[PDB]
Amino acid sequence: ISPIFQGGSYQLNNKSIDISSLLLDKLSGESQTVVMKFKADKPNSLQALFGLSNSKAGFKNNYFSIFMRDSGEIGVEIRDAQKGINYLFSRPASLWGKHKGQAVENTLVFVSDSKDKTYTMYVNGIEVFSETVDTFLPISNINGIDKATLGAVNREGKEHYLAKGSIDEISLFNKAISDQEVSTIPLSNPFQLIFQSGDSTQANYFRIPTLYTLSSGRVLSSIDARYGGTHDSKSKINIATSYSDDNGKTWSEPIFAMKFNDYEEQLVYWPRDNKLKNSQISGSASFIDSSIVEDKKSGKTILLADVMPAGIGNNNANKADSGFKEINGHYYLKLKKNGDNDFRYTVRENGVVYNETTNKPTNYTINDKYEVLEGGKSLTVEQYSVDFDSGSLRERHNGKQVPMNVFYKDSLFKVTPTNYIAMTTSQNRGESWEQFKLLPPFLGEKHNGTYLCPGQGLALKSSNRLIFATYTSGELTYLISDDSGQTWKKSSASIPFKNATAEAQMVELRDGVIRTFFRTTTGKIAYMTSRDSGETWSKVSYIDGIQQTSYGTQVSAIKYSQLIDGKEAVILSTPNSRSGRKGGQLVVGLVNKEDDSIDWKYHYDIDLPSYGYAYSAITELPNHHIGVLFEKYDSWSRNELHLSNVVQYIDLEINDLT
Numbered sequence: 272i273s274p275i276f277q278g279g280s281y282q283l284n285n286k287s288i289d290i291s292s293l294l295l296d297k298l299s300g301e302s303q304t305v306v307m308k309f310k311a312d313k314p315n316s317l318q319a320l321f322g323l324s325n326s327k328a329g330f331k332n333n334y335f336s337i338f339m340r341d342s343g344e345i346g347v348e349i350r351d352a353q354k355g356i357n358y359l360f361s362r363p364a365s366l367w368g369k370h371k372g373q374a375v376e377n378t379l380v381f382v383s384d385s386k387d388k389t390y391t392m393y394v395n396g397i398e399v400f401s402e403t404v405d406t407f408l409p410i411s412n413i414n415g416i417d418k419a420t421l422g423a424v425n426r427e428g429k430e431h432y433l434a435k436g437s438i439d440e441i442s443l444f445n446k447a448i449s450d451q452e453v454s455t456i457p458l459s460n461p462f463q464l465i466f467q468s469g470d471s472t473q474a475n476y477f478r479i480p481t482l483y484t485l486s487s488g489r490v491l492s493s494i495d496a497r498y499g500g501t502h503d504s505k506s507k508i509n510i511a512t513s514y515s516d517d518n519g520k521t522w523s524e525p526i527f528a529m530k531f532n533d534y535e536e537q538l539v540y541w542p543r544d545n546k547l548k549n550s551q552i553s554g555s556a557s558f559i560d561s562s563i564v565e566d567k568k569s570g571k572t573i574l575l576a577d578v579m580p581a582g583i584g585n586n587n588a589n590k591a592d593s594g595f596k597e598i599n600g601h602y603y604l605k606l607k608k609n610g611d612n613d614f615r616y617t618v619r620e621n622g623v624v625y626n627e628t629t630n631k632p633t634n635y636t637i638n639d640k641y642e643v644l645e646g647g648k649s650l651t652v653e654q655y656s657v658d659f660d661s662g663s664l665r666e667r668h669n670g671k672q673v674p675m676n677v678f679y680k681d682s683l684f685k686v687t688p689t690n691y692i693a694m695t696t697s698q699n700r701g702e703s704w705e706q707f708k709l710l711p712p713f714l715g716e717k718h719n720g721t722y723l724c725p726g727q728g729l730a731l732k733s734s735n736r737l738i739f740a741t742y743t744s745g746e747l748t749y750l751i752s753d754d755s756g757q758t759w760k761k762s763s764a765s766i767p768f769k770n771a772t773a774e775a776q777m778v779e780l781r782d783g784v785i786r787t788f789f790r791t792t793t794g795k796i797a798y799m800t801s802r803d804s805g806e807t808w809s810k811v812s813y814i815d816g817i818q819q820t821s822y823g824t825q826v827s828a829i830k831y832s833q834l835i836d837g838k839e840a841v842i843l844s845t846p847n848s849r850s851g852r853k854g855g856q857l858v859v860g861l862v863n864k865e866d867d868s869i870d871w872k873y874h875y876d877i878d879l880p881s882y883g884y885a886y887s888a889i890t891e892l893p894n895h896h897i898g899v900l901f902e903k904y905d906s907w908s909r910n911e912l913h914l915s916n917v918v919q920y921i922d923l924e925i926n927d928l929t
């Protein structure tokens with residue numbers, strides 16, 4: 272198809288450009304498509320890119336517009352006062368502003384389809400909304416339109432929503448172009464997707480990204496594949512992984528490192544209205560917060576994540592119970608059988624389900640996948656699916672059988688409703704993952720487990736020592752292994768907080784010397800120091816020059832291999848903002864070789880101070896570039912729940928940072 276109108280090189284400098292005589296007479300029929308390539312690295316709070324209005328006195332609410340906010344939200348308005356119609360559709364965090372100090376060219380595609388009565392918006396290849404209405408308003412059937420405008424909406428003779436920016440190109444079609452056609456429009460994206468809606472995870476949402484560079488040169492990533500919107504556990508969440516063999520240019524189709532099957536892998540468009548957005552999957556088991564390390568000695572890749580039984584998250588996780596019974600030095604997983612009100616069973620050697628009350632074994636065994644067998648026969652439960660068909664969240668049996676697992680709601684034998692940690696290993700650098708195994712309790716039998724710090728474990732350069740950071744109330748608890756993750760010991764380091772989400776990431780400043788950076792409740796990122804390979808830990812200090820909110824955000828951190836200005840370098844990834852999760856930065860720190868203090872010398876803006884930046888992952892790619900995988904939105908904001916494809920990957924070089 273061909274355009275009815277096309278223009279470009281429009282500078283939007285707080286002054287509207289009139290294009291009425293060019294466009295209005297060309298509009299015909301009830302379906303239209305807009306394609307607009309535009310930049311805005313210093314937008315006003317609220318600004319219209321494009322407008323069709325009745326500019327006459329007494330019709331200030333008769334217009335169509337495509338507008339954006341300085342938060343990076345995109346939307347349209349479709350209004351006609353005679354018709355009684357006031358459509359307003361939008362999605363937060365749809366835009367890029369700057370990248371490597373250069374305004375990004377956004378590609379916007381808006382489709383107004385009268386046949387299907389749907390309004391659809393894409394930005395940079397990604398569908399951001401699609402709204403069906405009972406009563407369709409085509410964008411030029413608005414009563415009395417007489418202006419077509421760029422960089423404002425002409426209301427009653429005046430410029431409303433003045434835009435700052437530029438439109439390199441704008442095209443208009445008297446047709447609703449097809450989805451397949453939309454995907455043929457070329458893009459200028461500064462980012463890539465590794466995990467996306469519609470891939471092999473069938474999750475519509477993703478949180479909690481990780482990156483780690485393996486010795487073979489392959490770069491691995493893990494992530495929460497979140498099914499029930501972007502909600503933390505309780506929910507359905509699996510841990511998925513992908514890898515790149517070409518320095519981050521291409522990424523393998525994701526597989527699962529940890530997954531439960533009590534609930535279907537449904538790709539669900541989660542409600543974003545205030546009435547329904549807190550809908551949360553309540554009967555599913557899940558995984559959350561993964562962390563990756565590589566073991567030199569074995570060559571194994573090791574991944575840990577939190578494991579939640581059906582309906583459990585960090586708020587209802589049975590505190591005061593580890594879920595294991597200690598029997599003369601040995602920890603055994605406890606089980607409750609349906610019909611008993613207490614936990615009478617333990618899983619002993621070879622998965623034998625042993626009755627602690629009668630002190631006899633039963634005919635039941637637990638296998639390697641934590642599945643229940645009776646006399647060697649595999650038991651099953653029926654799977655659940657979720658839907659919103661009835662106007663509220665419904666979780667129901669879908670007709671198919673899956674292996675009965677002790678983490679499931681329907682299981683004959685059930686684990687303690689608390690938080691667990693599990694590890695899986697890969698022998699082929701992420702091509703496949705072993706069945707996970709739970710880690711033993713570290714803080715005693717009558718105490719609920721810690722929570723894993725998402726991101727990277729630490730492989731000490733000059734030994735076989737492996738360290739994963741985890742947190743609980745009042746301390747970081749480091750998990751330490753010197754035998755390839757076969758056995759773990761804990762090392763406790765006290766922090767001056769109660770009940771924090773103390774997400775910690777580590778770097779080795781030099782051999783045996785670990786600095787850990789962690790999230791606090793103070794508005795500042797903290798750090799502590801070990802000088803004996805994590806055996807003991809210094810008191811807590813704080814970084815000046817970076818701000819977080821009172822609730823904080825995960826921070827990622829690496830030891831960079833090459834000197835910068837002749838010094839050893841550390842790199843931190845974090846929002847820099849006291850207001851929200853926005854203002855993303857990579858911060859470059861040079862180590863004082865004399866005292867291990869760190870000079871935070873360069874702050875690189877990922878995008879606009881007002882555009883969202885949340886949890887993140889950094890790794891030095893083999894070519895010495897920097898790989899960044901991050902939540903490109905405010906993942907705390909209750910206004911920005913359940914956005915698709917906002918976890919993005921970019922490639923930077925040190926020269927870009929400085």
Ligand SMILES: O=S(=O)(O)CCNCc1ccc(Cl)cc1
Pocket residue numbers: 503504505559560577579583584585586690722772823906907
């Ligand atoms: O700060 S955020 O709310 O965006 C993420 C915190 N996630 C913490 C957490 C970790 C483990 C479980 Cl089971 C539940 C919640």
